[PDB]
Structure 1
């Protein structure tokens, strides 16, 4: 007999439990094969990919990644794909782990307002990516059409305290990283495999700050980790921790005691972690510019007792978490909305600048702007700043080096350029600085920065 040869479906049909990320459906907890009816609906919708940056996502079930599907090896799955009548595109589905043409894609082609169905036996146990397979396939996947399906072994997976759902994807916007507004898909960037964002669960900050995953010291955590791509291979890593186990798809091989593991485009793995020390543990793609310049960071926050014999030291994690150490960056979202409305206040800018100043500036100038005498000059009550507050725009954009004097102290160092910052970002940061620490006040606009950036 084939694999999953467990007998005919028994009992009543089961109408399947789908879940939204980062959560997983419960274990099926049964010892017999069932007929499982799955209903999944495609929805095309604008969502925020980053604070003040909107994108038209194409979704399975209203989320990126799509709704999580959980069945048992040997089940017969009757799959219903609906395409919402608001959709502009046709869609379909390819489930990895399906035995058949297109993994279902050949049978699930569904126009807006229609529904398709096909049936498959889940022969292969494992964790599997599913995704849309409608031409142009890459555009559909790039727009967010991917998720996971778990096919349990017949005895179920071992019990753990938490199960979570995390999926990486690469995204291609016409605009640059953190450029505000509704950003179109960019086919040229996509073909060249040059993403503007690389994210977990469809957005910057999806799993950071107040949206972190949780567990307690001593608890076990299983994460179902997908890589939807379309194009990147993840050097998937947990900062400050180790994986007890890493298992790809339905593979017989299991790797144990590793921290860094390569996930193919379209690949999926199950990882397991045991919490040992409190704090924030960071899931990243260790192709590091993805993690720290394009959004590829997610957090597991562990609460419980300290273990000073295992780890003893200070906890200044804003030095690397930067602007994602805080609970959120809602001040940026709000400043952007107010700017679109034409109602942007000085305070709107100050609070957005405060959020962005973390990491970006604070690593050298400190959270309080004091700097460090002789090494980093102060922004707090800075005579150099007050002498020519406009020149601060050039300093941020193009850097500063050479001998300067600030508040009666000599400096001879190097501030790197930060040209990657967008005009609103520079404007907001500088407005924050001007309105803090007894600086002269006033404001810098995005338009001011635009003019300075354009100077030869």
Structure 2
């Protein structure tokens, strides 16, 4: 795209504020931002807010979201689809033109770990170029295992293909498959989907802790066989709904866009790989690390 040559729009912080007991404002951008997806490999990504996957959104079950998208892309329209919400796609997930803004309002009435992404045709093109992310909806009644959890993080899996190549997007194997982590609390890492950051700067935990991960596989195209090496998942909630409760799973199958809340105990000090057990994808980047110490600090 000629109008994208040399364009590298600096990341813009997500804006969110509560405006009522059950109403939340969210303002995001669509923007074109260079991301290092593998060492020495820059992808001029189509992004929300200059991150790919986009920034983490967290709301409460029953919140109505008043969402504004500011399209900074000079030529390509973009839109937003939240899997959390009940909305009319042809009225509420519509395109925002370059240099314009649009505001859309819809309720998040289901708890869980939901994908969000651009919904502009061809959707495959917008997702593959980087316009994906996660919104977490916190259950009103929590999860039955809340009291057991010591520490929590968010992980997202995505693929990267040849740059803006629709033939490759449809018909080719992914060039990279990657994990990223998005911050829930101050001090948490906030990273982009790349092959290396969560290996070189592992997530941190303490010996004996029960860890919760909020996870989603945004695709665009692959399913995920999510596994933490050296442990077993004590409890799994499919899509993050507290009713979809499994126990003692070694590996959790996630469809494309599929989410889960998974919980596991780390019993010994060491470094614990986190993989998709589809090992062609792991080899192409989809390995993160969890470093477990006696004190919890690196």
**1:162 paired to 2:151:** yes
Superposed counterparts of 1:56-71, under 5 Å: 56-71=44-59
Tell me the TM-score normalised to structure 2 length. Answer: 0.83
Is the helix fraction higher in 1 or 2? 1
After superposition, where does 1:293-442 map in structure 2 within 5 Å?
Answer: 294-304=284-294
Q: Following the alignment from structure 1 to structure 2, what is the Cα–Cα distance between the partners of residues 263 and 118? A: 29
Matches of 2:177 and 2:289 in 1, distance apart?
A: 15
Work out the number of aligned pairs and report it. Answer: 265
Partner Cα distance (1:142, 1:78) in 2: 26
Q: Is the 8 A contact 1:92 1:105 kept in 2?
A: no
Aligned to 1:53: 41
Map 1:209-358; keep pairs closer than 5 Å.
209=200, 211-251=201-241, 252-292=243-283, 294-304=284-294
Q: Does 1:111 align with 2:97?
A: yes
Query: What residue in structure 2 maps to residue 144 of structure 1?
Result: 130
Q: For residues 221 and 205 of structure 1, what CA distance do their matches in structure 2 show? A: 22
Cα separation, 1, equivalents of 2:202 and 2:252:
22
Of residues 180, 193, 199, the one that matches 1:208 is: 199
Aligned-residue Cα RMSD (Å) equals 2.2
* Mapped contact 1:93–1:105 kept (Cα < 8 A): no
Q: CA deviation at 1:250?
A: 4.7
CA shift for structure 1 position 108: 4.2
Classify 1:289/1:87 alpha carbon distance in 2 versus 1 (closer, same or farther; 3 Å).
same
Listed as ranges, the gaps of 5+ residues in structure 2 are: 1-14, 181-192
8 Å contact kept, 2:49–2:55: yes
Please identify the structure whose Cα radius of gyration is greater: 1
| SS of residue matched to 2:168 | helix
Residue number among 113, 117, 123 corresponding to 2:109 in the alignment: 123
- Partner of 2:85 in structure 1? 98
- 1:80 equivalent in alignment to 2:71: no
Work out the CA distance in 1 between the residues paired with 2:252 and 2:141. Answer: 27
Shift of 1:95: 0.7
Q: Which residue pairs with 1:16 in the alignment?
A: 16
CA shift in 2, pair 1:87/1:228, >3 Å: farther
Consecutive aligned runs of 4 or more in structure 1 exceeding 6 Å deviation: none
Distance 1:107 1:168 in 2: 23
* Structure 1 or 2: more strand by fraction: 2
Residue number among 154, 161, 169 corresponding to 1:172 in the alignment: 161
1:199 to 175, 178, 189: 178
- Which of 1 and 2 has higher RCO (CA within 8 Å, sep 6+)? 2
Change (3 A) 1:265 1:121: same
Whole-angstrom distance in 2 between the partners of 1:87 and 1:217: 49
Distance 1:105 1:259, change over 3 A: farther
2:165 to 173, 179, 186: 186
Instruction: Give the Å deviation of 1:33.
Output: 3.8
Structure 2 counterpart SS, 1:119: strand
Partner of 2:9: none
Structure 1, gaps ≥5 residues long:
1-14, 18-27, 174-183, 306-456
